[PDB]
Every structure is written in structure tokens, then in C-alpha cells.
Amino acid sequence: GFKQDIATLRGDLRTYAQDIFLAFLNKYPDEKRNFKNYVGKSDQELKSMAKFGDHTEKVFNLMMEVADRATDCVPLASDASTLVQMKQHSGLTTGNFEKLFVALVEYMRASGQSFDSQSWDRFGKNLVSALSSAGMK
Amino acid sequence: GFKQDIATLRGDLRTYAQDIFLAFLNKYPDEKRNFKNYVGKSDQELKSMAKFGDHTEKVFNLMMEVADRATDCVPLASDASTLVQMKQHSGLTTGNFEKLFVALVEYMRASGQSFDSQSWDRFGKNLVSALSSAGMK
Numbered sequence: 050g051f052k053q054d055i056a057t058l059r060g061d062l063r064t065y066a067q068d069i070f071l072a073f074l075n076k077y078p079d080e081k082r083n084f085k086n087y088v089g090k091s092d093q094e095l096k097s098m099a100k101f102g103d104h105t106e107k108v109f110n111l112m113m114e115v116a117d118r119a120t121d122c123v124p125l126a127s128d129a130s131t132l133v134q135m136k137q138h139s140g141l142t143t144g145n146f147e148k149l150f151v152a153l154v155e156y157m158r159a160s161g162q163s164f165d166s167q168s169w170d171r172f173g174k175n176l177v178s179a180l181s182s183a184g185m186k
Numbered sequence: 187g188f189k190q191d192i193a194t195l196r197g198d199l200r201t202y203a204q205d206i207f208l209a210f211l212n213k214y215p216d217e218k219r220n221f222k223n224y225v226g227k228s229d230q231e232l233k234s235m236a237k238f239g240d241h242t243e244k245v246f247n248l249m250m251e252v253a254d255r256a257t258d259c260v261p262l263a264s265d266a267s268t269l270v271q272m273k274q275h276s277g278l279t280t281g282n283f284e285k286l287f288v289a290l291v292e293y294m295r296a297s298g299q300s301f302d303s304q305s306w307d308r309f310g311k312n313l314v315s316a317l318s319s320a321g322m323k
């Protein structure tokens with residue numbers, strides 16, 4: 050289930066983080082509006098760009114902690130508030146997060162490794178709701 | 187995005203070339219008049235012929251070179267000119283290329299792969315414009 054999936058992802062976190070974020074960027078190419086430095090780069094080139102590697106690593110380290118602190122895929126309100134208060138996220142809306150989780154769930158379903166994709170779908174929806182309550186536009 | 191799509195296509199160049207060319211020929215059966223040596227054969231009959239695989243791979247390799255040399259999905263005028271001046275392309279008009287890219291985009295949208303179909307649509311339109319500028323009727 051969801052808790053085991055956190056352990057699966059953490060066991061190969063760099064690769065899963067890269068894979069999933071690339072699946073997000075390739076499913077929704079207009080999302081590069083927030084990452085102007087990623088334009089004109091293949092997946093392999095992005096993986097060898099320091100700011101892509103460092104951002105994706107931080108995203109997934111923190112996302113796994115938020116998932117780990119959740120109860121039944123409902124994140125702590127404090128985790129949603131922290132994400133809202135992040136200065137580097139001033140231009141983001143809940144739709145950016147929604148799209149990330151749609152891409153993540155699709156990636157899990159296509160993987161062939163026993164992920165509980167329905168729980169990740171609920172987690173993404175519950176994170177979006179919590180972000181809204183915490184003040185994200 | 188577009189650059190990643192070039193890498194996806196190049197990774198399995200011949201297979202994609204055959205499936206896209208077949209998609210084109212089947213969507214536009216009259217276009218086979220330019221390909222008199224491929225008439226009267228099913229998709230699998232064509233794929234079994236080494237000359238079909240060789241032809242499609244050579245075509246698609248050049249298409250990927252033109253795509254990779256493009257800037258923001260605008261091909262180089264010199265590449266458009268090469269395509270206009272090729273002896274094998276005598277008598278073609280831009281409508282032949284418009285149909286190819288319609289079929290290519292439709293194939294991408296129907297595929298399970300995460301192609302940036304909007305960029306390929308724009309690339310096809312910009313290639314048609316560039317072919318006109320390079321002297322194709």
C-alpha cells in the first residue's frame with residue numbers, strides 16, 4: 050500500500066524522482082513556463098543539468114516526508130502551510146501540483162511494480178485540497 | 187517536449203518510421219501514387235520487405251536531422267531547400283507534406299507515448315511555410 054510505496058520510492062529515490070518529474074514535464078509541456086531553463090532539452094540532457102537534478106531531488110525528499118506524515122493519505126495541515134509559504138513557489142497554483150500527481154499516478158500504473166496508485170491519486174487530491182485551505186491560489 | 191520526442195523517435199527509428207509512414211499511406215490512400223512500388227500490399231507485407239525498412243529509416247533519419255536543427259520548431263531555410271531540390275521530390279507540393287504531418291500528429295496522439303503533439307503540429311506547419319519560401323508550389 051501507500052506506506053510500502055514510500056519505502057519503494059525511497060529505495061531508488063534519485064531515479065524515481067527523475068522519472069516522475071520528467072513524466073510530468075512531458076505530459077504537460079507548457080509547465081516549462083515555470084522552468085524556462087528546461088526548454089530545448091531532452092530527458093537525458095535535463096538529467097545532466099544541476100538545477101534540474103537538485104530541484105527534483107528536493108521535491109521528492111520532501112514529498113516522501115509529507116506522504117510519510119500523512120494519515121490515510123491526508124497530509125498534515127502544517128505540511129500544506131509550509132509548501133504555501135515557500136518563497137520559491139510564489140508563482141504556483143494548486144493546478145501545478147494537481148498535474149504533478151496525475152503524471153505520478155499514470156507513471157505508477159504503467160510501471161508494472163505493485164504501487165497502490167489509487168492511494169497516490171487520493172494523496173494528490175488531498176494535498177491539493179490542503180494547499181487550498183492553507184492559502185494557495 | 188520536442189527535443190525529447192526526437193530522442194524517443196531516434197531510439198527506435200525504423201519502427202517509428204514504418205508505423206508513421208503506414209499511418210500516412212492509410213489515412214491518404216491517393217498519396218500512394220507517389221509510391222508505385224508499395225501498392226497492393228498490407229502493412230505487414232510492406233514491413234516484411236527490407237527495401238521498405240531501408241527507405242523509411244533513411245527518410246525518418248533526415249526528418250529527425252531537420253527537426254533537431256530547427257529552432258523552436260522552425261526548420262532552417264537551408265533544410266527546407268534541400269527537401270525542395272531533392273530529385274525524389276520533384277513534382278511534390280506543400281500539400282503532400284501537410285498531409286504527412288497531419289498523419290504523424292494523429293499517430294502521436296493515438297500512441298501510449300507522451301509526445302508533444304502540439305510541437306509536431308507546429309513543426310509541420312512551419313516546415314510547409316519554409317518549403318513554400320524555398321520554392322515548392
Ligand code: HEM
Pocket residue numbers: 080083084100103104107108109111112137138141145146149
Ligand atoms: C511537493 C512538491 C514540491 C516541493 C517539495 C518543492 C520544493 C522546492 C524547493 C525546496 C525549492 C528550493 C530550490 C531548491 O531546493 O532547488 C523549490 C524551487 C522551485 N520550485 Fe519547487 N517544489 C515542489 C513542486 C513544484 C512544482 C509542482 C513546480 C512547478 C510546476 C515547482 C517549481 C519550482 C521552481 C520554478 C523553483 C525555483 C527553482 C529554480 O529557479 O531553479 N515546484 N521547490
Ligand code: HEM
Pocket residue numbers: 217220221223240241242244245246248249252269274275278282283286
Ligand atoms: C520532412 C519530410 C521528408 C523527408 C525528410 C524526406 C526525405 C526523403 C529521403 C531521405 C528520401 C530518400 C529515401 C531513400 O533513400 O529511399 C526520400 C525519397 C522520397 N520521398 Fe521524401 N521526404 C519527406 C517528405 C516526403 C513527402 C511528404 C513525400 C510525398 C508525399 C515524399 C516523397 C518521396 C518519394 C516519392 C521518394 C522516392 C521514393 C523512391 O525512391 O521510390 N517525401 N525522401
Ligand SMILES: COc1cc(Br)ccc1O
Pocket residue numbers: 203204206207210241242243245246286
Ligand atoms: C511521406 O514520405 C515518407 C515518410 C516517412 Br515517415 C517514411 C517514408 C516516406 O516515404
